[PDB]
Amino acid sequence: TNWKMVEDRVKKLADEFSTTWHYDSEHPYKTWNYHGSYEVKATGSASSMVNGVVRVLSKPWDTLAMTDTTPFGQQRVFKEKVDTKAPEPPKGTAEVMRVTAKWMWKFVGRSKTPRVCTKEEFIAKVNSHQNRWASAREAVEDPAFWEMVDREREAHLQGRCEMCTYNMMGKREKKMGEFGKAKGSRAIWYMWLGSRYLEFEALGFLNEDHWMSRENTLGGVEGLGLQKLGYVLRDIAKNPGGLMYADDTAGWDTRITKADLENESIVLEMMTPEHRALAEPLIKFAYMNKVVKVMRPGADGITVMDVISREDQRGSGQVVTYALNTFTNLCVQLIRCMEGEGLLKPEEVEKLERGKQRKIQDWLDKNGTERLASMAVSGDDCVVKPKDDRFATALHFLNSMSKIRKDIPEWKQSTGWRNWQDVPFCSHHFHELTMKDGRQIVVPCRHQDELIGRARLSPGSGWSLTETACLSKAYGQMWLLMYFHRRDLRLMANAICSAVPVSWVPTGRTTWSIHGKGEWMTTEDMLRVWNRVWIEENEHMEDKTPVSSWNDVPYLGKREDSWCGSLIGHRARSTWAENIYTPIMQIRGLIGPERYVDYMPTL
């Protein structure tokens, strides 16, 4: 019965594709109300090409379905993950969420004030990493494009919305898990570029002004690269409290309740009316009443496009998806801390006690800063060090908020970690190492099979040798900067760089995490970049003496490296390393004549 909100958007699609627009009574949508369907050509594929460069240089890992833009792929993820409704919080829980959100918004806005983002900033982003136009940069250079933005912006000021419709492109696996980089059914969403700017214009200040940064929220890690994250966990462990907990919420984006949207939407109260006049219509029309285009398999070998709507979820493609998820997750963990400390009873979920609203405010006013400082929240990933170990059994308000934990019974006690180095965070754990010179360094680490698996695969077909070589070099230089402590990766990274020409600039996408800042994507010597990253820019390195050679860069212990998937000690690797020059030359022959550098002697 939300037809009025989504009336204009559906009709525009229906009118534009009226020659094929129709109604399909056999649609499988359950939690989405279905409007109509029109025919489209099949877009995308399920072909994941193997990286020949990485393949020949990782022969022992030959023993070691990924990204489905196919219309069959889009429907499968929608049927299993997207098409669901998270239960709304009860009355008592909602007040707790509302009080926490108000306190957090006032806290995160203590020094920063909301502002409107200009098109010049948006033009800066598109130039720095389509139906009529064929390029994003070409569109922003067209005055006709900005007219479409203006007319749609005028509609928002008039209380209307016509073009802010989402596109369900398909699936992109969330994690690289068991092996081969295959885990997670994450849904990727695309939206029109004009709507992207209007969203950026109204809510871009959350990202551009770093509202979720650690110096602002005290619990967020926004803007911190993977190198900085390790020291954060060690610093949290220095604080008093109990064990460290890192619980994943299964389908977090699909479990964003309508109360969560409302609680995040009270930032408009901190904005100027002129700014609110632009942001208020957008949140109501784009987030709170979505219009989504999904391809569905059809009969006679034809593909069809559906138009549907809902009210609650998070689009996962919203420009402030990460920032809003960090805000709500920080609120969720703070609420669970209150239940663990006895402030919130399991019965107060249905109805809060008499004075337990100002008392919650009192607890946040006193313990909010201290509790947040012992948290590390990146989107839906979280690490919390609570006051005591009663936090493990404080599952009532957590499950009431539909933030059900992943791969665990609903009411089974959560288990914490005794050593901060074992705590998972952003698909990584962190090891503490002592260098040859005696200095200590905290490094990110994850199972080696996951790292090799993603490099071996390339998105789509039609890859040239030059393109797939630069992507391989990007993986190799990334390994040297982040995973230098892994013996197999360091040897394999040099092998790629020895096989790939020196002058070639690395390209491609080697990481999906927002914490991958791509310092490895330069042609500068990685040893020089390594000194800048881990010594010069390292706030936890008082002694700024630079490292003079790669041999001074430490490895993990053979016990800790073997535990995390290294193939040292196996006969297969011993042969692989001894004869590593043979695969290097084969790639050089295939590429052709060029200038190269041999990096094996540096090992």
Enumerate binding residues for Zn ion (CB under 5 A): 161, 164, 445, 564
Rounded CA gap, 281 and 265, in Å? 11
Least distance in Å: CB of 264 to Zn ion? 19
Cβ-proximal residues to 188 (8 Å cutoff; 6+ apart), any chain: 169, 170, 171, 172, 316, 317
Q: Compute CA 271 distance to the chain's CA centroid, rounded to the nearest angstrom.
A: 27
- Please identify, using beta-carbon distances, which residue of 190 and 463 lies nearer to Zn ion: 190
Residues 6+ apart with CB under 8 A from 182: 65, 66, 173, 176, 453
Phi and psi (nearest 5°) for 459?
-75, 110
DSSP secondary structure, 552-591, as one string: GSPPPPHHHHHHTT--TT-HHHHHHHHTTHHHHHHHHHHH
Nearer to Zn ion, 445 or 497 (CB): 445
CB 205 within 8 A of CB 268: no
Residue number with CB closer to Zn ion (481 or 564): 564
CB of 446 to Zn ion, least distance (A): 7
| C-beta of 448 vs 468, nearer to Zn ion | 448
| Dihedral over Cα of 182, 183, 187, 189: its sign | negative
Q: Is there a binding annotation on residue 156?
A: yes
Tell the smallest beta-carbon distance from residue 389 to Zn ion (Å): 26
Q: Least separation, in Å, of the C-beta of 535 and Zn ion? A: 22
Pairing of strands 381-384, 303-310: unpaired
Please indicate if the annotation marks 161 as binding a ligand. Answer: yes
Q: How far is the CB of 437 from Zn ion (least distance, A)?
A: 22
Q: Which is nearer to Zn ion, 38 or 197 (CB)?
A: 197
Annotated binding residue at 445? yes
Report the candidate in 181, 183, 179 with the shortest Cα–Cα distance to residue 60: 179
Q: Which is nearer to Zn ion, 193 or 445 (CB)?
A: 445
Residue ranges of E strands in 449-509? 457-459
Measured between alpha carbons, how far is residue 540 from residues 218, 234, 248, 285, 425 in Å? Answer: 18, 11, 29, 46, 19
Q: What whole-number distance in Å separates Cα of residue 67 and Cα of residue 73?
A: 8
* Residue whose CB is less far from Zn ion, 442 or 497: 442
- Whose structure tokens read 């390029």? 135
**Nearest CB to Zn ion, comparing residues 73 and 554:** 554
Shortest distance, position 514 Cβ to Zn ion, whole Å: 22
- Residue closer to Zn ion by CB (options 161, 267) is 161
Is 564 assigned to a binding site? yes
Cα 337 to Cα 394: distance, rounded to the nearest angstrom? 8
Q: Is 540 annotated as a binding residue?
A: no
Distance between CA 254 and CA 349 in Å, rounded? 22
Minimum separation from the CB atom of position 310 to Zn ion (A): 17
Annotated binding-site residue? 264: no
Minimum distance from residue 463 beta carbon to Zn ion (Å): 31
Helix (H, G, I), strand (E, B) or coil at 341: coil
From the list 478, 474, 417, the residue with the least C-alpha distance to 446 is 478
Helix locations, 258-357, DSSP H? 258-265, 273-282, 321-340
Spell out the residues 6+ positions from residue 329 whose beta carbon is closer than 8 angstroms to its own.
252, 377, 379, 380, 382
Report the nearest approach of Zn ion to the CB of residue 201 (Å).
Answer: 12
| 348 marked as part of a ligand binding site | no
Instruction: Please report, in range form, the residues annotated as the binding site for Zn(2+).
Output: 152, 156, 161, 164, 429, 431, 445, 564
Instruction: Please report, in range form, the residues annotated as the binding site.
Output: 152, 156, 161, 164, 429, 431, 445, 564
